[PDB]
Amino acid sequence: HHMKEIATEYSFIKYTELELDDNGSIKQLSIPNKYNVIYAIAINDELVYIGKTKNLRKRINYYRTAINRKDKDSTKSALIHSALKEGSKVEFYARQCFNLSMTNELGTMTIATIDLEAPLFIKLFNPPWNI
Amino acid sequence: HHMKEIATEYSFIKYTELELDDNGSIKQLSIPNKYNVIYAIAINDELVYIGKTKNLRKRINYYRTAINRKDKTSDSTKSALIHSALKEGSKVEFYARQCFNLSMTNELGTMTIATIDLEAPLFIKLFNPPWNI
Amino acid sequence: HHMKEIATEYSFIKYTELELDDNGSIKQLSIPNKYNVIYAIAINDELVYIGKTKNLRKRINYYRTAINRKDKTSDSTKSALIHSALKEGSKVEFYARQCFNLSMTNELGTMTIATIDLEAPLFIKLFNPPWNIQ
Amino acid sequence: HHHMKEIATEYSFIKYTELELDDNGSIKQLSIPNKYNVIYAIAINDELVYIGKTKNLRKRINYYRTAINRDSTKSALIHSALKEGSKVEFYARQCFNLSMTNELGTMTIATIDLEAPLFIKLFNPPWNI
């Protein structure tokens, strides 16, 4: 699946493209954060993964460092690093989701719509990295 | 407009019966309060009015005291009809249906709705209660 | 956990009562139907069970039938508990709390939730009714 | 004057289409898939000029394309901008419908109805009088 066509149709915005610095480590982000999104990982404009997260910058930090964390499954982190070393384009796209809550005499029940959309998107696109 | 049937199928629960004290005013209640409810007023087991309120105890106290018209600009017509009913020996009951709150949060913040705002107009069109407009 | 207080706090409305006849049969139930609810079983006014159902008249009659037929293939612990309550001469009541549905639609289609699915777990954690196997 | 690109990323407005004139000076027809239940933004030379809401985007844009030919102020403003050689784009933020069904039947809330007023207040676009 070509990313740019999925982006237009399902309202994903390009959030960032990862780049290696002078010494081969992934440059950290210095752009505004996004919360409660479905994210798509694209390699060379091909959709490879559909994810969900409450904090996009935090998630991307995780992908940035996962394979280097001795204290800690970091396969996706490994693949992102490998792809960057070969010179492939790695991008994160984000689709904005929401929180819905109802408060009755039982208290508050909340639903993060990312929880609903992730499975539908994964079934819809069958991304390679989604197993 | 039979209250008993309506109560069952729409989960209205009888909240209180009103009555006059020796001075011709409505007795105070000693009942746990209820909040964010659709309320129904029934007279001799017949539905006469559908309302909504955030605070049922407060609303009922409003009907209790509105007759005295401390606030000349407040609507005292329903209070007047309630006192007339009691004066004529009729039974006056309040029923309450419990509603809730719905919220949604986006990048900006939180929009919240009390469902009484959604249900009230629908109940009024559905029942066409005598005291509603 | 007393059913009187629970019923008012959570708007449980009494739906029906079960009763044995002279030869020990659960009399028939003349009751309108009630769909999509949390139901409560009360024994001597005390909450013993929180259930959920798409169709309450059907669920109750299931209980009645299993007991009258002495059917033990049912996954029948509850039916067996109800019958011994009845036999011990206790009062057996069902209450219902009306629930509803929530739907959301976007380009992915329509997502929907029956609130009974949300409430049952919370009532069980709240009251720990005896008959609810956790 | 808010720059469309800033708004786009911050509030997830995606570029929907750029209007073009045909040789007869008429606005070309839309060729892209439709979108429903959106907040739309009108941008002229990358500047936000208007925030609106619609259940059917192609329908609304078609209205702007044909309105002056039949209050059609915005339509007229869009035509003059295009004739002046200015870039005119529509951006869209995807919204949704929520429904509740109980004993009363079905009550529905369209989020475009919630979000439109907030964006208009937030950005205070020139065309939003």
Coordinates of C-alpha atoms in Angstrom, one line a residue:
Chain A
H1 CA 0.0 0.0 0.0
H2 CA 1.3 3.4 -1.0
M3 CA 1.4 5.7 2.0
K4 CA 0.5 8.9 0.3
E5 CA -2.8 7.4 -1.0
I6 CA -3.7 6.0 2.4
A7 CA -2.9 9.3 4.0
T8 CA -5.3 11.3 1.8
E9 CA -8.2 8.8 2.1
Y10 CA -7.9 8.1 5.9
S11 CA -6.6 11.5 6.9
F12 CA -3.1 10.7 8.1
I13 CA -0.7 13.6 8.3
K14 CA 3.0 13.2 7.8
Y15 CA 4.4 13.7 11.3
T16 CA 8.1 13.2 10.7
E17 CA 10.8 11.6 8.6
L18 CA 13.6 10.0 10.6
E19 CA 17.2 11.0 9.8
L20 CA 20.6 9.8 11.1
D21 CA 23.0 12.4 12.5
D22 CA 26.7 12.9 11.8
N23 CA 27.4 9.8 13.9
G24 CA 24.7 7.4 12.7
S25 CA 22.2 7.7 15.5
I26 CA 18.6 8.8 14.9
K27 CA 18.1 12.5 15.4
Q28 CA 15.7 13.3 18.2
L29 CA 12.6 15.2 17.4
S30 CA 12.0 18.9 18.1
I31 CA 8.5 19.3 16.8
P32 CA 5.2 19.6 18.7
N33 CA 3.8 16.4 20.2
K34 CA 0.6 14.6 19.3
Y35 CA -1.6 12.5 21.5
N36 CA -4.1 9.7 21.0
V37 CA -3.2 8.8 17.4
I38 CA -3.2 5.9 15.1
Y39 CA 0.3 6.0 13.5
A40 CA 1.5 4.5 10.3
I41 CA 5.2 3.6 9.7
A42 CA 6.2 4.0 6.0
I43 CA 9.4 2.8 4.4
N44 CA 10.1 4.3 1.0
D45 CA 6.4 5.4 0.8
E46 CA 5.2 1.9 1.6
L47 CA 3.0 1.2 4.6
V48 CA 4.7 -1.4 6.8
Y49 CA 3.0 -1.0 10.2
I50 CA -0.1 0.4 11.9
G51 CA 0.2 1.3 15.6
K52 CA -1.6 3.2 18.3
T53 CA -0.3 5.4 21.1
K54 CA -1.3 8.0 23.6
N55 CA 1.9 9.9 23.2
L56 CA 3.6 10.0 19.7
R57 CA 6.9 11.6 20.7
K58 CA 7.3 9.1 23.5
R59 CA 6.5 6.2 21.1
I60 CA 9.0 7.4 18.6
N61 CA 11.6 7.8 21.3
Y62 CA 11.0 4.1 22.1
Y63 CA 11.6 3.1 18.5
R64 CA 14.7 5.3 18.5
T65 CA 16.2 3.5 21.4
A66 CA 14.6 0.1 21.9
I67 CA 17.3 -2.0 20.2
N68 CA 19.9 -0.3 22.3
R69 CA 18.3 -0.9 25.7
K70 CA 20.0 -3.8 27.5
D71 CA 17.5 -3.6 30.4
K72 CA 14.7 -4.7 28.0
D73 CA 10.8 -7.6 21.8
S74 CA 12.4 -4.8 19.8
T75 CA 12.1 -6.2 16.3
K76 CA 10.4 -3.1 14.8
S77 CA 13.1 -0.9 16.3
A78 CA 15.7 -3.1 14.7
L79 CA 14.1 -2.9 11.3
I80 CA 13.8 0.9 11.5
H81 CA 17.5 1.2 12.3
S82 CA 18.4 -1.2 9.5
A83 CA 16.3 0.6 7.0
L84 CA 17.9 4.0 7.9
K85 CA 21.4 2.6 7.5
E86 CA 20.6 1.4 4.0
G87 CA 19.3 4.9 3.1
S88 CA 15.6 4.1 2.9
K89 CA 13.0 6.8 3.8
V90 CA 11.4 6.1 7.1
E91 CA 8.3 8.2 8.0
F92 CA 5.7 8.3 10.7
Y93 CA 2.2 9.4 9.7
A94 CA -0.5 10.1 12.3
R95 CA -4.3 10.0 12.3
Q96 CA -5.9 12.0 15.1
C97 CA -8.2 10.1 17.5
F98 CA -10.2 11.0 20.6
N99 CA -11.3 10.1 24.1
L100 CA -15.0 9.4 24.9
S101 CA -16.3 9.1 28.4
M102 CA -19.6 8.5 30.2
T103 CA -20.1 9.2 33.8
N104 CA -23.1 7.7 35.6
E105 CA -23.8 6.4 39.1
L106 CA -21.1 3.7 38.5
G107 CA -18.4 6.3 38.0
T108 CA -16.6 7.1 34.7
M109 CA -16.2 4.7 31.8
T110 CA -13.7 5.9 29.2
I111 CA -13.0 4.7 25.6
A112 CA -9.9 5.6 23.6
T113 CA -11.0 5.4 20.0
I114 CA -7.4 4.4 19.0
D115 CA -8.4 1.1 20.7
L116 CA -11.2 0.7 18.2
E117 CA -9.5 1.9 15.0
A118 CA -6.2 0.0 15.3
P119 CA -7.8 -3.5 14.7
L120 CA -9.9 -2.2 11.8
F121 CA -6.9 -0.6 10.1
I122 CA -4.8 -3.7 10.6
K123 CA -7.5 -5.9 9.1
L124 CA -8.0 -3.4 6.3
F125 CA -4.4 -3.0 5.2
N126 CA -2.8 -6.1 6.5
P127 CA 0.6 -4.4 7.0
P128 CA 3.7 -6.6 6.8
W129 CA 4.9 -5.7 10.3
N130 CA 1.5 -6.4 11.9
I131 CA 1.4 -10.0 13.0
Chain B
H1 CA -50.9 9.8 30.4
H2 CA -51.0 7.0 33.0
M3 CA -48.0 7.4 35.2
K4 CA -47.6 3.8 36.4
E5 CA -47.2 2.4 32.9
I6 CA -44.9 5.2 31.8
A7 CA -42.9 4.8 35.0
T8 CA -42.2 1.2 34.3
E9 CA -41.3 1.4 30.6
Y10 CA -39.1 4.5 31.0
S11 CA -37.6 3.8 34.4
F12 CA -39.2 6.6 36.2
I13 CA -39.0 6.0 39.9
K14 CA -41.4 7.6 42.3
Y15 CA -39.4 10.2 44.2
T16 CA -41.9 11.9 46.6
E17 CA -45.6 12.8 47.2
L18 CA -46.3 16.4 48.1
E19 CA -48.8 17.5 50.8
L20 CA -49.9 20.6 52.6
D21 CA -49.0 21.5 56.2
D22 CA -51.5 23.3 58.5
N23 CA -50.5 26.7 57.1
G24 CA -51.3 25.7 53.5
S25 CA -47.7 25.3 52.4
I26 CA -46.0 22.1 51.1
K27 CA -44.2 20.0 53.7
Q28 CA -40.4 19.8 53.4
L29 CA -38.9 16.5 52.4
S30 CA -36.2 14.4 54.2
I31 CA -35.1 12.4 51.1
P32 CA -31.7 11.7 49.6
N33 CA -31.2 14.2 46.7
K34 CA -31.0 13.2 43.0
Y35 CA -29.1 15.0 40.3
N36 CA -29.3 15.3 36.5
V37 CA -32.7 13.8 36.1
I38 CA -35.8 14.1 33.9
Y39 CA -38.7 14.6 36.3
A40 CA -42.4 13.9 35.8
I41 CA -45.2 15.5 37.8
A42 CA -48.3 13.3 38.2
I43 CA -51.7 14.3 39.5
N44 CA -54.0 11.5 40.5
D45 CA -51.7 9.1 38.7
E46 CA -51.9 11.2 35.5
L47 CA -48.8 12.7 33.9
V48 CA -49.1 16.5 33.6
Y49 CA -45.5 17.8 33.2
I50 CA -42.1 16.7 32.0
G51 CA -39.1 18.7 33.2
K52 CA -35.3 18.4 33.5
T53 CA -33.0 19.5 36.4
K54 CA -29.5 19.3 37.7
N55 CA -30.8 19.2 41.3
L56 CA -34.1 17.6 42.0
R57 CA -34.4 18.6 45.7
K58 CA -33.7 22.2 44.7
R59 CA -36.3 22.1 41.8
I60 CA -39.0 20.7 44.1
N61 CA -38.2 23.3 46.7
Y62 CA -38.7 25.8 43.9
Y63 CA -42.2 24.5 43.3
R64 CA -42.7 24.6 47.1
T65 CA -41.9 28.3 47.4
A66 CA -42.5 29.8 44.0
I67 CA -46.1 30.4 45.0
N68 CA -44.9 33.1 47.4
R69 CA -43.3 34.9 44.5
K70 CA -40.3 36.3 46.3
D71 CA -39.0 36.6 42.7
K72 CA -41.8 38.3 40.8
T73 CA -40.1 37.4 37.5
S74 CA -39.9 33.6 38.2
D75 CA -42.6 31.4 36.6
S76 CA -45.0 30.6 39.4
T77 CA -47.8 29.1 37.2
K78 CA -46.8 25.4 37.7
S79 CA -46.4 26.0 41.5
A80 CA -49.8 27.6 41.5
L81 CA -51.3 24.6 39.7
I82 CA -49.6 22.2 42.2
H83 CA -51.1 24.1 45.1
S84 CA -54.5 24.1 43.5
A85 CA -54.3 20.3 43.0
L86 CA -53.4 19.8 46.7
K87 CA -56.1 22.2 47.8
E88 CA -58.6 20.2 45.9
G89 CA -57.4 17.0 47.7
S90 CA -55.7 15.5 44.7
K91 CA -52.5 13.4 44.9
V92 CA -49.4 15.1 43.6
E93 CA -46.3 13.0 42.9
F94 CA -42.8 13.6 41.4
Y95 CA -41.1 10.8 39.5
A96 CA -37.5 10.9 38.4
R97 CA -35.6 9.2 35.6
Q98 CA -31.8 9.2 36.1
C99 CA -29.6 10.6 33.3
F100 CA -25.9 10.9 32.9
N101 CA -23.0 12.9 31.4
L102 CA -21.1 12.3 28.1
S103 CA -17.8 13.8 27.4
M104 CA -15.3 13.8 24.5
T105 CA -11.8 15.1 24.5
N106 CA -9.8 16.3 21.4
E107 CA -6.6 18.3 21.1
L108 CA -8.3 21.4 22.4
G109 CA -10.1 20.2 25.5
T110 CA -13.3 18.6 26.7
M111 CA -16.9 19.0 25.4
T112 CA -19.5 17.6 27.9
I113 CA -23.2 17.0 27.6
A114 CA -25.8 16.2 30.3
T115 CA -28.2 13.8 28.6
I116 CA -31.2 15.5 30.3
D117 CA -30.6 18.1 27.5
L118 CA -31.1 15.4 24.9
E119 CA -34.0 13.5 26.5
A120 CA -36.2 16.4 27.7
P121 CA -37.4 17.7 24.3
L122 CA -38.0 14.1 23.2
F123 CA -40.1 13.2 26.2
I124 CA -42.2 16.4 25.7
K125 CA -42.9 15.7 22.0
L126 CA -43.7 12.1 22.9
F127 CA -46.1 12.6 25.8
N128 CA -47.5 16.0 25.0
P129 CA -48.0 16.7 28.7
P130 CA -50.8 19.2 29.6
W131 CA -48.5 21.7 31.4
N132 CA -45.8 21.7 28.8
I133 CA -45.9 24.1 25.8
Chain C
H1 CA -25.8 -5.9 50.4
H2 CA -29.4 -4.9 50.9
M3 CA -31.5 -4.7 47.7
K4 CA -33.7 -1.9 49.0
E5 CA -30.8 0.6 49.0
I6 CA -29.1 -0.7 45.8
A7 CA -32.4 -0.5 43.9
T8 CA -32.8 3.2 44.6
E9 CA -29.1 4.2 44.3
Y10 CA -28.8 2.5 40.9
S11 CA -32.4 2.7 39.6
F12 CA -33.1 -1.1 39.7
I13 CA -36.8 -1.7 39.2
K14 CA -38.4 -4.9 40.5
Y15 CA -39.2 -7.0 37.5
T16 CA -40.7 -10.2 39.0
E17 CA -40.8 -12.7 41.8
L18 CA -40.5 -16.4 41.7
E19 CA -42.9 -18.6 43.8
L20 CA -43.6 -22.3 44.2
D21 CA -47.2 -23.6 44.0
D22 CA -48.9 -26.2 46.2
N23 CA -47.1 -29.2 44.6
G24 CA -43.8 -27.3 44.3
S25 CA -43.8 -25.9 40.7
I26 CA -42.6 -22.4 39.9
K27 CA -45.8 -20.7 38.7
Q28 CA -45.9 -19.1 35.3
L29 CA -44.8 -15.6 34.8
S30 CA -47.1 -12.9 33.3
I31 CA -44.6 -10.1 32.5
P32 CA -43.9 -7.7 29.7
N33 CA -40.5 -8.1 28.0
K34 CA -37.5 -6.1 28.9
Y35 CA -34.4 -6.0 26.7
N36 CA -30.7 -5.0 27.1
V37 CA -30.5 -4.8 30.9
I38 CA -28.4 -5.5 33.9
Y39 CA -30.4 -7.8 36.1
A40 CA -30.1 -8.5 39.8
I41 CA -31.2 -11.6 41.7
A42 CA -32.2 -11.0 45.3
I43 CA -32.9 -13.6 48.1
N44 CA -34.6 -12.3 51.1
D45 CA -33.9 -8.8 49.8
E46 CA -30.2 -9.5 49.6
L47 CA -28.2 -9.2 46.4
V48 CA -26.8 -12.6 45.3
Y49 CA -26.1 -12.1 41.6
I50 CA -25.6 -9.5 38.9
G51 CA -26.3 -10.7 35.3
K52 CA -26.6 -9.1 31.9
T53 CA -29.1 -10.1 29.1
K54 CA -30.5 -9.0 25.7
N55 CA -33.8 -10.4 26.8
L56 CA -34.9 -10.7 30.4
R57 CA -38.2 -12.5 30.0
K58 CA -36.3 -15.3 28.1
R59 CA -33.5 -15.5 30.7
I60 CA -35.9 -15.7 33.7
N61 CA -38.0 -18.4 32.0
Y62 CA -34.8 -20.3 31.3
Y63 CA -34.3 -20.4 35.1
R64 CA -37.9 -21.4 35.7
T65 CA -37.9 -24.2 33.1
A66 CA -34.5 -25.6 34.2
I67 CA -35.8 -25.8 37.7
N68 CA -39.3 -27.2 36.9
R69 CA -37.8 -29.8 34.6
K70 CA -35.1 -30.7 37.2
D71 CA -32.7 -30.2 34.3
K72 CA -29.0 -30.4 35.5
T73 CA -27.3 -30.2 32.1
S74 CA -27.8 -26.4 32.1
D75 CA -24.6 -25.2 33.8
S76 CA -27.1 -25.2 36.5
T77 CA -25.4 -24.0 39.7
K78 CA -27.5 -20.8 39.7
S79 CA -30.7 -22.7 38.9
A80 CA -29.8 -25.1 41.7
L81 CA -29.1 -22.2 44.1
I82 CA -32.4 -20.5 43.2
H83 CA -34.3 -23.8 43.8
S84 CA -32.8 -24.4 47.2
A85 CA -33.6 -20.8 48.1
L86 CA -37.2 -21.4 47.0
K87 CA -37.3 -24.7 49.0
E88 CA -35.8 -23.1 52.1
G89 CA -38.9 -20.9 51.7
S90 CA -37.0 -17.8 50.9
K91 CA -38.2 -14.9 48.7
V92 CA -36.6 -14.8 45.2
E93 CA -36.7 -11.5 43.3
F94 CA -35.4 -10.2 40.0
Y95 CA -34.6 -6.5 39.4
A96 CA -33.7 -4.9 36.1
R97 CA -31.6 -1.8 35.4
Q98 CA -32.2 -0.5 31.9
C99 CA -29.1 0.0 29.8
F100 CA -28.6 1.4 26.3
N101 CA -26.4 1.4 23.2
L102 CA -23.7 3.8 22.0
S103 CA -22.5 4.0 18.4
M104 CA -19.8 5.9 16.6
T105 CA -19.4 6.3 12.9
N106 CA -16.5 7.4 10.7
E107 CA -14.9 6.3 7.5
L108 CA -14.0 2.9 9.0
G109 CA -17.7 2.1 9.6
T110 CA -19.7 1.9 12.8
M111 CA -18.4 0.9 16.2
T112 CA -21.0 0.0 18.8
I113 CA -21.1 -0.9 22.5
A114 CA -24.0 -2.2 24.7
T115 CA -23.5 -0.5 28.0
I116 CA -24.5 -3.7 29.9
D117 CA -21.0 -4.9 28.7
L118 CA -19.5 -2.0 30.5
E119 CA -21.6 -2.0 33.7
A120 CA -21.7 -5.7 34.6
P121 CA -18.0 -5.9 35.4
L122 CA -18.3 -2.7 37.5
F123 CA -21.3 -4.0 39.5
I124 CA -19.5 -7.3 40.2
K125 CA -16.4 -5.5 41.4
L126 CA -18.5 -3.2 43.4
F127 CA -20.7 -5.7 45.3
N128 CA -18.9 -9.0 44.9
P129 CA -22.3 -10.8 44.7
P130 CA -21.9 -14.4 46.0
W131 CA -23.2 -16.2 42.9
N132 CA -20.8 -14.3 40.6
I133 CA -17.8 -16.6 39.9
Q134 CA -14.8 -14.3 39.6
Chain D
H1 CA -3.1 35.8 9.3
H2 CA -2.6 32.2 10.2
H3 CA -0.4 30.1 7.8
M4 CA -2.2 27.1 6.5
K5 CA 0.7 24.8 6.9
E6 CA 1.0 25.4 10.7
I7 CA -2.7 24.8 11.3
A8 CA -2.6 21.8 9.1
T9 CA -0.1 19.9 11.2
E10 CA -1.3 21.1 14.6
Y11 CA -4.9 20.3 14.0
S12 CA -4.8 17.6 11.4
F13 CA -6.3 19.4 8.5
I14 CA -5.3 17.5 5.3
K15 CA -5.0 19.3 1.9
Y16 CA -8.1 18.2 0.1
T17 CA -7.9 19.9 -3.3
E18 CA -6.6 23.0 -5.1
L19 CA -9.2 24.7 -7.4
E20 CA -8.2 25.5 -11.0
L21 CA -9.6 27.5 -13.8
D22 CA -10.2 26.1 -17.2
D23 CA -9.5 28.1 -20.4
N24 CA -13.1 29.4 -20.4
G25 CA -12.4 30.9 -16.9
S26 CA -14.7 28.4 -15.2
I27 CA -13.6 26.4 -12.1
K28 CA -12.7 22.8 -13.2
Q29 CA -14.7 20.0 -11.8
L30 CA -13.6 18.0 -8.8
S31 CA -11.9 14.7 -9.5
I32 CA -11.1 13.4 -6.0
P33 CA -13.0 11.0 -3.7
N34 CA -15.5 12.7 -1.4
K35 CA -15.3 13.2 2.3
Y36 CA -18.1 13.5 4.8
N37 CA -18.6 15.2 8.2
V38 CA -15.6 17.6 8.1
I39 CA -14.4 20.9 9.2
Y40 CA -13.0 22.6 6.1
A41 CA -10.5 25.4 5.8
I42 CA -10.2 27.7 2.8
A43 CA -6.7 28.9 2.1
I44 CA -5.6 31.6 -0.3
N45 CA -1.9 31.7 -1.0
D46 CA -1.3 29.5 2.1
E47 CA -3.3 31.9 4.3
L48 CA -6.3 30.7 6.2
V49 CA -9.3 32.8 5.2
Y50 CA -12.3 30.7 6.3
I51 CA -13.4 27.9 8.6
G52 CA -16.6 26.1 7.8
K53 CA -18.4 22.7 8.4
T54 CA -20.1 20.3 6.1
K55 CA -21.6 16.8 5.9
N56 CA -20.5 16.5 2.2
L57 CA -17.4 18.2 1.0
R58 CA -17.7 17.9 -2.7
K59 CA -21.2 19.2 -2.4
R60 CA -20.1 22.3 -0.5
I61 CA -17.1 22.9 -2.8
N62 CA -19.5 22.5 -5.8
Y63 CA -21.7 25.2 -4.3
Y64 CA -18.7 27.6 -4.2
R65 CA -17.9 26.6 -7.8
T66 CA -21.4 27.5 -9.1
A67 CA -23.0 29.9 -6.6
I68 CA -22.2 33.2 -8.4
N69 CA -23.7 31.7 -11.6
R70 CA -27.2 31.5 -10.2
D71 CA -25.6 35.4 -0.5
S72 CA -22.7 34.2 -2.6
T73 CA -20.0 36.4 -1.3
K74 CA -17.4 33.7 -0.6
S75 CA -18.0 32.1 -4.0
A76 CA -17.4 35.4 -5.7
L77 CA -14.3 36.0 -3.6
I78 CA -13.0 32.5 -4.6
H79 CA -13.5 33.3 -8.3
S80 CA -11.8 36.6 -8.2
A81 CA -8.8 35.1 -6.3
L82 CA -8.5 32.4 -8.9
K83 CA -8.6 34.9 -11.8
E84 CA -6.0 37.0 -10.0
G85 CA -3.7 33.9 -10.2
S86 CA -3.8 33.2 -6.5
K87 CA -3.7 29.7 -5.1
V88 CA -7.0 28.6 -3.6
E89 CA -7.1 25.4 -1.6
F90 CA -9.5 23.5 0.6
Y91 CA -8.2 21.6 3.7
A92 CA -10.3 19.2 5.7
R93 CA -10.3 17.9 9.3
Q94 CA -12.1 14.6 9.6
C95 CA -14.9 14.5 12.2
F96 CA -17.5 12.0 13.1
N97 CA -21.0 11.1 14.4
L98 CA -21.8 9.8 17.8
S99 CA -25.2 8.1 18.5
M100 CA -27.0 6.9 21.6
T101 CA -30.1 4.6 21.3
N102 CA -32.3 4.1 24.3
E103 CA -36.0 3.9 25.1
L104 CA -36.5 7.3 23.4
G105 CA -35.0 6.1 20.2
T106 CA -31.8 7.5 18.7
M107 CA -30.1 10.7 19.6
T108 CA -27.1 11.8 17.4
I109 CA -24.3 14.3 17.9
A110 CA -22.2 15.5 14.9
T111 CA -18.8 16.6 16.1
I112 CA -18.5 19.1 13.3
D113 CA -21.2 21.0 15.2
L114 CA -19.0 21.0 18.4
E115 CA -15.7 21.7 16.8
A116 CA -16.6 24.4 14.2
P117 CA -17.3 27.2 16.7
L118 CA -14.1 26.5 18.6
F119 CA -11.9 26.7 15.5
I120 CA -13.7 29.9 14.4
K121 CA -13.0 31.4 17.8
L122 CA -9.5 30.1 17.9
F123 CA -8.4 31.3 14.4
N124 CA -10.8 34.2 13.9
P125 CA -10.5 33.9 10.1
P126 CA -11.2 37.0 8.0
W127 CA -14.2 35.5 6.1
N128 CA -15.9 34.4 9.3
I129 CA -18.0 37.5 10.0

